């Protein structure tokens, strides 16, 4: 009975929390000295790429409303809050020569101070897709190896300013999603690949993302970890891949390959210092090679790994492009039966067992000693017709969270050392290409009235069932 | 050539301006002591009635941004600005016993003082559809004759507080629209008639609108006009009605009847103290009767009439009770596959600039009004969330529309109509009632992604250059 | 000797405090976003119903003066403070679709934080008669079963915002008084029954009060209590009922019936899930019936019960439909020319300290309540605008009254009643409903001539010295 799941089902030190990212909630896009990111530029120059043509200039205004966010987090009563730092907020020009923005640093310091004053642990991501436009424009951002040193200097700035208080850092969030939607589908900033090349650019970008991560982890471990005694990791996009036919050796291989191309692509490098075999084989000369120094810096470059999980698919065997390199076909149905029901999004199929399976797979395949679920959540059905009191009865979310958290506990019984779980998201917010219509929050946002926060049923259940 | 039309084509004292209404722009819906109106309640409880399910809680935030609106009006350089007072902002419970809200009065004082400090004449409408919910709940708002005294107390409050500076008052804006969409179609607040009765309620509501207007004009004329030396009138909804067949006596009658049911409904009472003949005939016992004292108070109850104009229709004779069916006409958009005019961004707004000339001439001929203002005329942009600001601000359709209509107003003045001024609708993109924010009427663009940032469209710049000073 | 009664006569963890209610003290009636309640409307539209025609617009201004009230509570030195939240201050339109008022929530946060910062426990009542007018107008407030869900949403808002700090909640205060004076005598808001029906409406209103209470307790117990670890109960109006003739079986029955109609009306439902037998018999088909699920939700729906007590009466058997006549009793004040007790400053409050012992013993015996608080007990000063402050603050009658009643509470605890605390009514002289400001219940005197200046009466000083820490 997942409806009964509670903190008593978990070890005493187990961390519960909720999440956000800077571009999705802050707004103040041009306030307090912030410089533009590639998402500012993409949403302003190409509003046809966004449902409703909207953008993050104001978002849900957590830049000015952070005290209310902290007050909501206090009332919610969970242990921790995952948020990201906007790189071009602290460094409007991305590199140190573009200036250091003291007011941007002061904002993160105030947020961190308010969190700690209320017994809430900050889990901080350095990079959640908001590449400074100045770096994008100067040398192509993550297309260039110059991104690695610039990212290290930004990481060092954050460790120096905030590391006395922040003890849990993540270099990157979902580099898979950044790489594939930025450079293969062209659906996300910087909008390339749909001028772009979906067969080459995603592999360069992922290669540089890995090097940025490894270099920032090295910097933290060598230069900060002894004095600040924090931990550093990374968050990866996951989706469970099930063989379409359980008894087809070909489908079992296809599902494993889809896991290689999505998760292994980032996990094998930080495990053995190389890409997955299946990727080396199918991608060939279009897959860059690590030097022996790079491989050594990459191998074991984490204190923990965060996994983000939403959904699952069946998998069968199938101009260069990433999509076709995987050599699989995804399937949603067996004999007319979907792997799970849809959320408010047609791509999000609810399959709670998938999170147990991805956690078991990750421990088995990469032998990760400490794991967090850094994102798990579900979006409401679109319906501008509902009043607040009807909109806040989010019983699909409530069941979703319960079933998934239940499955996390099952993975822990199977032997996975999971140290915490963060719902996505605290607040309804800017859902990238879908704009504001897709609501993931446990807290409702009234976009008609200054982004007023009101807890959904799932928030209240979380507080009552998980508050220490 | 309408593209050449400018201030030099008009008398020295001709007044050019732009407009808004309180619920459409202010926001601050629960800020500064404001009480709810029936539009708060309608948008909150029935968001399915609004495109996108939006509301006026924040609108374009002119409640907090009024200084910026004043600065835009100054840069625009036109003579005047037409806005409305929110009744439930100054009197949150509608009647005096619900309290007088000093902060609400302070807001309108600040707006009026900013306007005057920049050489801009305030044209102020008392009622633009935002009935205090407290009155709606206590006795049914305009369904009740109690509305008349309450509206008089509210009018007197505004004349007392503001009349030393405001010299141009309008009792009501488009009582036609309020009555028909509130009580016949149920599409606007309070959402009745679609519990409601489209055959009876619109006529009671209009009867009380008329009595409120006449009573407030009487109050201004007897109690304020000598000391304050201002003028008071009313703004009416109009649409030009053309016989579908120019040579059909039947279609000529039908167009005239459609004019009687829309404009005569309000104009004949303030002209002769009774409703149009065609209304008495087709509405029968469902049309209320004025007492002789009520007729005397209504007849000549204005110093000026404002007209609002957008579009036109062909009209033919029609083929249980309801206002729409009482008119006994059928509206037609096309003759032989040719529409009366092309669509704006709205499929109901067909661009027919000659219609504003015709409605002016018709109004002067039929009701012999000695001073007229065009209190609204404007057009909405094609819906397109794909455009950047610099593409969105090139409003060529609006620029043409304004030029052609202003040209037509000048033609009406040559025909003998004493038009004293003209007000574009609207200054700002705003809340367009049941269509929400997607329908942009502004000469000033609104960035809804970024704190409602104002930016002048091409039409604003042309207005300043061609009509300033 | 009750004059010697002190903290050392009670258990270490016994809670002493004082009380207020939102409408009686706050003022700021239209400040900080607050929406109207039915008491705003009642006092404004029907000032003849209030002695002196006054109202709660400003009251004693605890809305702005809350820091001073906290400082007084600190100096007073008692453990706890009982206040109510104004429903229409946090939710101006009563239901969520009327908006959530952040400033109203900020006020109660500030008050709670000041209280805790000074070692004072907040005891918080959700509903103390100030029904949002928006709910009253939309569907008749407590006359409608819609009130139950709306009250649940309001309760949940308060638990969410405040429950991390507030660990003692009361759903309702004196629903008896609300029901009887609102709907049987029509003397209190909403002023019905004196359009109303004193034979039916009080029973519907009480039925819905009970369902709102049971539903809000269920919500707290299932959704908040595990994470917040607080307690929730309810406060009931009581008056001691003594047989006029100790040896008349008929008078014994009549007193018990009077107890059934006042206290059993609310207590039996939360005890066994039904109304008292005597009520079912005498009220018949006019008494609503609980469904089996409603009975299950009501039975045991509290962690504690608060009792409010002032006075006592003799009772005898009585000699078209109405609550008052359904009780079938006659109240008597005298035996052989000897009143049950002397009058306070009010002719209805007869001082009978033994009555609080008896109502405690009766409540434990009849309903087997395991934890009881006296949530109100107090007495009003003789009316005399002739006294200077130093004469007015010598409240010997109150000082005696408190001592004798507190002594009686201690006697009830010796008899076996588990009383966990005691709250004087009231902290401050305040708005005493239909009697206005002339009726002073405070242990703290209010100077109504001079910005409601607070000054402790003799009783406040005795309470501090005898019951502090």
Curated annotation (Swiss-Prot), chain A:
Active-site residue list: 174 (proton donor), 375 (nucleophile)
Sites where the protein binds a beta-D-glucoside: 24, 128, 173-174, 310, 375, 424, 431-432, 440
Residues of the site described as Controls the gate shape and acceptance of substrates: 347
GO terms, molecular function: raucaffricine beta-glucosidase activity; vomilenine glucosyltransferase activity
Signal peptide: none
Gene3D superfamilies recorded: Glycosidases (3.20.20.80)
E.C. number: 3.2.1.125, 2.4.1.219
Catalytic activity: raucaffricine + H2O = vomilenine + D-glucose; vomilenine + UDP-alpha-D-glucose = raucaffricine + UDP + H(+)
Listed result of changing residue 440 to Y: Reduced activity
Keyword Ion transport: no
One Pfam assignment: Glyco_hydro_1
GO BP, one annotated term: carbohydrate metabolic process
Effect annotated for changing residue 347 to A: Loss of activity
Site description Directs the conformation of W-392, residues in chain: 345
Keywords: Alkaloid metabolism, Disulfide bond, Glycosidase, Hydrolase, Transferase
InterPro entries: Glyco_hydro_1, Glyco_hydro_1_N_CS, Glycoside_hydrolase_SF
Job description of the protein: Glucosidase specifically involved in alkaloid biosynthesis leading to the accumulation of several alkaloids, including ajmaline, an important plant-derived pharmaceutical used in the treatment of heart disorders.
Annotated PANTHER family: GLYCOSYL HYDROLASE, MYROSINASE 3-RELATED
Family recorded in the similarity comment: Belongs to the glycosyl hydrolase 1 family.
UniProt-recorded name of the protein: Raucaffricine-O-beta-D-glucosidase
Species: Rauvolfia serpentina
Lineage: Eukaryota, Viridiplantae, Streptophyta, Embryophyta, Tracheophyta
């Amino acid at each position: 009975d997942a409806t009964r799941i509670s903190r008593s089902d978990f070890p005493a030190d187990f961390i519960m929390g909720t999440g956000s990212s800077a571009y999705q909630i802050e707004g103040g896009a041009r306030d307090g000295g912030r410089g533009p990111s590639i998402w500012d530029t993409f949403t302003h120059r190409r509003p046809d790429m966004i449902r409703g043509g909207t953008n993050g200039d104001v978002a849900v205004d957590s830049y000015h409303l952070y005290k209310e966010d902290v007050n909501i987090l206090k009332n919610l009563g969970l242990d921790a809050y995952r948020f990201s730092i906007s790189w071009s907020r602290v460094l409007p020009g991305g590199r140190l020569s573009g200036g250091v923005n003291k007011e941007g640093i002061n904002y993160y310091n105030n947020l961190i101070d308010g969190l700690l004053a209320n017994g809430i642990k900050p889990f901080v991501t350095l990079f959640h897709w908001d590449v400074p436009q100045a770096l994008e424009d100067e040398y192509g951002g993550f297309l260039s190896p110059r991104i690695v040193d610039d990212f290290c200097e930004y990481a060092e700035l954050c460790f120096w300013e905030f590391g006395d208080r922040v003890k849990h850092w993540m270099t990157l969030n979902e580099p898979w999603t950044f790489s594939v939607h930025g450079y293969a589908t062209g659906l996300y900033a910087p909008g390339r690949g749909r001028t772009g090349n979906p067969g080459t650019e995603p592999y360069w970008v992922t290669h540089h993302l890995l090097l940025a991560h490894a270099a920032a982890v090295e910097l933290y471990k060598n230069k900060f970890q002894r004095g600040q005694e924090g931990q550093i990791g990374i968050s990866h996009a996951t989706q469970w891949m099930e063989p379409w036919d359980e008894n087809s050796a070909s489908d079992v291989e296809a599902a494993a390959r889809a896991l290689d191309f999505m998760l292994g692509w980032f996990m094998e490098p930080i495990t053995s210092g190389d890409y997955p075999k299946s990727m080396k084989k199918f991608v060939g000369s279009r897959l860059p090679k690590f030097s022996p120094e790079q491989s050594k810096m990459l191998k074991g470059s984490y204190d923990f790994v965060g996994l983000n999980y939403y959904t699952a698919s069946y998998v069968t065997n199938a101009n260069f492009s990433y999509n076709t390199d995987i050599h699989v076909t995804y399937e949603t149905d067996r004999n007319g039966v979907p792997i799970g029901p849809q959320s408010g999004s047609d791509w999000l199929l609810i399959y709670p067992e998938g999170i147990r399976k991805i956690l078991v797979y990750t421990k088995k395949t990469y032998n990760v000693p400490l794991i967090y679920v850094t994102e798990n959540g579900v979006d409401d059905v679109k319906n501008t017709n509902l009043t607040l009191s009807e909109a806040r009865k989010d019983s699909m979310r409530l069941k979703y969270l319960q079933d998934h958290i239940f499955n996390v506990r099952q993975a822990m019984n199977d032997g996975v050392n999971v140290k915490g779980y963060f719902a996505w998201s605290l607040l309804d917010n800017f859902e990238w290409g879908e704009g504001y219509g897709v609501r993931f929050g446990i807290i409702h946002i009234d976009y008609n009235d200054n982004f007023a926060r009101y807890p959904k049923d799932s928030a209240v259940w979380l507080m009552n069932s998980f508050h220490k």
